[PDB]
Design a protein around this nucleic acid. Structure first.
Ligand SMILES: [Zn+2]
Ligand SMILES: [Zn+2]
Ligand SMILES: [Zn+2]
Ligand SMILES: [Zn+2]
Length: 112
DNA sequence: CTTCCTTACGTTGAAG
DNA sequence: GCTTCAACGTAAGGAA
């Protein structure tokens, strides 16, 4: 029900509406006391502080590799699921089409 | 190729 | 019940 006069965007709650209008003001009052960069919202600065501490709190449950963020970990999860590959049950090689495995399995048949 | 690092939205749930 | 408002979640996309 909340709309931005400028960029014309609707928000569900008032919190994101109030924050969005402050970002428009360009003001950045949340400063990192290590590198002295400023940020418009505190939640942004909280994420920036990881670049100094080096903590990697977001660990994948599969390969156990840790990341600086959850967005970085979310996109990493798109790699543990991908296109399947057929497997010759003799030489254990992989193939990308069934008609390719049938032509290869038929090779093991002719010679033996 | 991945990952870092930035921003922008969202709902949930203590706490007045 | 009605307001925050912090702590998360989702995602995008150039930089490293
Ligand atoms: Zn706007
Ligand atoms: Zn800093
Ligand atoms: Zn993983
Ligand atoms: Zn084979």
């Amino acid at each position: 029900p909340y709309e931005c006069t400028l960029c014309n965007k609707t928000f569900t709650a008032k919190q994101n509406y109030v924050k969005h209008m402050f970002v428009h003001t360009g003001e950045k009052p949340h400063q990192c006391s290590i590198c002295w960069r400023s940020f418009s919202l505190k939640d942004y600065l909280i994420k920036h502080m990881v670049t100094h501490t080096g903590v990697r709190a977001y660990q994948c449950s599969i390969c156990n590799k840790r990341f600086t963020q959850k967005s970085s970990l979310n996109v990493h999860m798109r790699l543990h699921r991908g296109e399947k590959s057929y497997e010759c049950y003799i030489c254990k090689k992989k193939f990308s089409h069934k008609t390719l495995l049938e032509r290869h399995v038929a090779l093991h048949s002719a010679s033996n």
